[PDB]
């Protein structure tokens, strides 16, 4: 699926190179490659910052006011954990493969069985898959991911991530959340309270104030987590606190981290496509890039009618084309390969 | 055995002392052990005198080498409460020691107790001003490294540009004291070689020269380190005072022993 | 190097990570927090395509997964009787990290 | 910052909104010339006591 995204961007670059070759027949290889790379980078930045971020944070960057040469844009250590966790909390147990005519095809397993969707845990580092053989299969992957709803933005992880993540050493499987916790301890990440204080967030003094709606319900995860920490809120780590904070959105800590990191990335970059001083694009080219969404990239690469995809492929709404058959769970999918 | 990482999970050892001094001690103790093994092969009554001669010569050579390489000429040590690191307002109670040698200075920061603020405070940092080595570069690398505040303070106190001129005088003193100590070592080698030869009076003269050069190095170090304008080293609520360390006194004692033995050799030759 | 919002939190204050017994076991914390039923739809109807596009963005931005040198291991001690990694109650299973 | 600068620039700093850890505060090369010249243009021939 990450591979499908990479293939999408690779084919988009090739398509832009072909377009520029059509427009400028006299251009050589280097000129075509550089112009296509510039355009693709601009489109990627626009989609990532002005379309994906507002949809997956419910927060928008402030209006671009120019290039800040004195602003450090380096990725913060907290951003790694925040982004990784608020993405891992939404990984589905399976992924649909969808036709351009709103038809969800069956997925041929390596066990020769036909499943309703492609199981995530059994597709890690897949050298080859029987249902993934041609460009049409990758297009089906992209369409199905566009039509399928992700998992809930909560503390719960699917077993494909929590138990069957690719083990990098001596085990074919490992816990991705435990690995992320050990990464946060490895990077010397701050405590949850210190992280909140450094970002200007309001201090949290009680364990039930981490997520009021979570403590309202019958879920006992807050009390159990406090028991693990010996009721010491000052020892709660940034990553578990960000996991617990999330409710319908990344928590205030994680949302603040990601938003501030992306603000610094946009403002501190001299090659940002909106920075008119770098000479990358004219005003008209900047306006064209701003008008380009991921739906445009998918339509251009897959070469299908625009009505086959919703206008904002990052969010599915009632009335959008090709609804998913049902919310995927572990039921009906192949069992994950044992460690 | 495998299946676990790392294969060796134990803490890695740290050498318990200076490696140069340890090597000198090992070499000269090996020579002493060899000559002790050889001792029964010595002929007759001239064994205790032979033992004294051999042990004295080896001690003179070891003293020359160790003192020339010891950073223990000007020593000082004060127990204080001082700020420890950056981005931390907590203070540490520690012994801060300055050990200025011929080629540089060792700054020691030993916690009392060593385990303070969940950290091991047993720093022993060297900053060298030897010829060809840039002291300012070493201090800049220490600043980039992030050494604790007392270490950085005492290191910048010896920078070439520091208002108190410790660097210039101490570099000059150490350089010429080391040169004369090397001359004394050469004279000691020649003293051994010419005590092997039948002309004992010339060997006694060379031993006397060894003593004279040791005394000259001592006097030059004293005079060149005395010309310093008073640099007040203030840590916390205390002031650190330096004084002639045990390297200075070992130089004095070894030089006096060498000059006394040389004078005794010359007077005995004149009287016999 | 990566930036820091807060000064680094290490056991020795330099490089040694904070771990047990001061902090809970990573696998215990993972089991306590992340165990739950799959199939809970996103409350904003966020799509899977968006999730993996964000993964692509992260791969574009940061990468701290490849190990460093010299090889240092911060191994995850599996609690005894873990249903997934220690099903035989052997009690010495260790996930290498 | 809050008395000399407003009086000698007729410009005021924006309201202080906190510490910016990611902002480079290093003196720019242009600032040397700018400050030195707008100060040197006002040096009097003499000074009263």
């Amino acid at each position: 699926f990450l591979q499908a995204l990479g293939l999408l961007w690779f084919r988009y670059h090739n398509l832009w190179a072909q377009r520029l070759a059509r427009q400028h027949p006299d251009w050589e290889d280097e000129e075509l490659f550089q112009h296509a790379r510039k355009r693709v980078i601009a489109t990627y930045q626009n989609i990532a910052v002005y379309e994906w971020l507002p949809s997956f944070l419910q927060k928008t960057l402030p209006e671009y006011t120019g290039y800040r040469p004195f602003l450090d844009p380096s990725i913060s250590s907290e951003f790694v954990a925040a982004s990784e966790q608020f993405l891992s909390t939404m990984v589905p147990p399976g992924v649909y493969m969808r036709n351009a005519s709103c038809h969800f095809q069956g997925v041929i397993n390596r066990n020769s069985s036909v499943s309703r969707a492609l199981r995530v845990c059994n597709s890690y580092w897949s050298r080859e898959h029987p249902s993934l053989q041609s460009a049409e299969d990758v297009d089906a992957l992209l369409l199905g991911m566009a039509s399928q709803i992700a998992e809930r933005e909560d503390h719960v992880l699917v077993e494909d991530v929590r138990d069957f993540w690719p083990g990098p050493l001596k085990f074919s499987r490992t816990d991705h959340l435990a690995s992320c916790l050990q990464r946060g301890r490895d990077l010397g990440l701050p405590s949850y309270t210190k992280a909140r204080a450094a970002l200007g967030l309001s201090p949290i003094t009680r364990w039930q104030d981490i997520n009021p709606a979570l403590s309202r319900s019958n879920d006992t995860v807050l009390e159990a987590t406090a028991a693990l920490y010996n009721q010491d809120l000052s020892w709660l780590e940034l990553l578990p606190g960000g996991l617990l904070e999330s409710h319908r959105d990344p928590g205030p800590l994680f949302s603040t981290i990601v938003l501030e990191q992306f603000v610094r990335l946009r403002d501190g970059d001299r090659y940002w496509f909106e920075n008119t001083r770098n000479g990358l694009f004219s005003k008209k080219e900047i306006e064209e890039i701003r008008n380009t969404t991921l739906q445009d990239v998918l339509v251009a690469v897959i070469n299908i009618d625009p009505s086959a995809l919703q206008p904002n492929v990052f969010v599915w709404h009632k009335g959008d084309p090709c609804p998913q058959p049902r919310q995927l769970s572990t039921e009906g999918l192949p069992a994950c390969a044992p460690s | 055995l495998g299946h676990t990482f790392p294969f060796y999970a134990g803490p890695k050892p740290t050498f318990p002392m200076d490696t140069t001094l340890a090597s000198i001690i090992m070499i000269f103790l090996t020579a002493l052990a060899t000559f002790i093994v050889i001792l029964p092969g010595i002929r007759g009554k001239t064994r205790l005198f032979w033992l004294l001669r051999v042990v004295t010569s080896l001690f003179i050579g070891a003293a020359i080498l160790a003192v020339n390489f010891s950073s223990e000429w000007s020593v000082g040590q004060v127990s204080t409460n001082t700020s420890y690191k950056a981005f931390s307002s907590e203070w540490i109670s520690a012994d801060i020691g300055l050990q200025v040698g011929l080629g540089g200075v060792n700054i020691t920061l030993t916690g009392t107790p060593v385990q303070q603020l969940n950290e091991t405070i047993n720093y022993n940092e060297e900053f060298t001003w030897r010829l060809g080595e840039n002291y300012a570069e070493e201090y800049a690398k220490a600043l980039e490294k992030g050494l604790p505040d007392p270490v950085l303070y005492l290191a910048e106190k010896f920078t070439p540009r520091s208002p108190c001129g410790l660097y210039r005088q101490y570099r000059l003193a150490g350089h010429y004291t080391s040169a004369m100590l090397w001359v004394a070592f050469l004279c000691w080698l020649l003293a051994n070689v010419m005590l092997s030869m039948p002309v004992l009076v010339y060997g006694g003269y060379m031993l006397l020269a060894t003593g004279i050069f040791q005394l000259l190095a001592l006097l030059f170090f004293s005079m060149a380190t005395s010309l310093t304008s008073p640099c007040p080293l203030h840590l916390g609520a205390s002031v650190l005072h330096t004084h002639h360390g045990p390297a200075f006194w070992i130089t004095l004692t070894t030089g006096l022993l060498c000059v006394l033995l040389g004078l005794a050799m010359a007077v005995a030759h004149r009287m016999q | 190097r990566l930036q820091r919002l807060v000064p680094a939190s290490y056991a020795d204050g330099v490089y040694q990570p904070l771990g047990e017994p001061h902090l809970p076991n990573p696998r215990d914390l993972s089991n306590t927090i992340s165990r739950g039923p799959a199939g809970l739809a996103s409350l904003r109807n966020r799509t899977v395509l968006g999730v993996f596009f964000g993964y692509h963005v992260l791969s574009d931005l940061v990468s701290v997964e490849t190990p460093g040198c010299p090889a240092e291991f911060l191994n995850i001690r599996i609690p005894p009787g873990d249903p997934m990694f220690d099903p035989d109650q052997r009690g010495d299973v260790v996930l290498p990290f | 910052v809050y008395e000399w600068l407003p009086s000698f620039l007729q410009k005021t700093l924006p309201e202080y909104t906190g510490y910016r850890p990611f902002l480079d505060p290093s003196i720019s090369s242009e600032f040397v010339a700018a400050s030195e010249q707008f100060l040197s243009t006002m040096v009097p021939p003499g000074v009263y006591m």
Partner: peptide
């Protein structure tokens, strides 16, 4: 209790910024 309850500012401008220790320092 120590009257100096804060982290004393360095004279050379080092360690003022958390990640850029040379910022504002002497010689930069």
């Amino acid at each position: 209790q120590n009257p100096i309850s804060w982290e004393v500012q360095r004279f050379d401008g080092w360690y003022n910024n958390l990640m850029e220790h040379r910022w504002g320092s002497k010689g930069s």
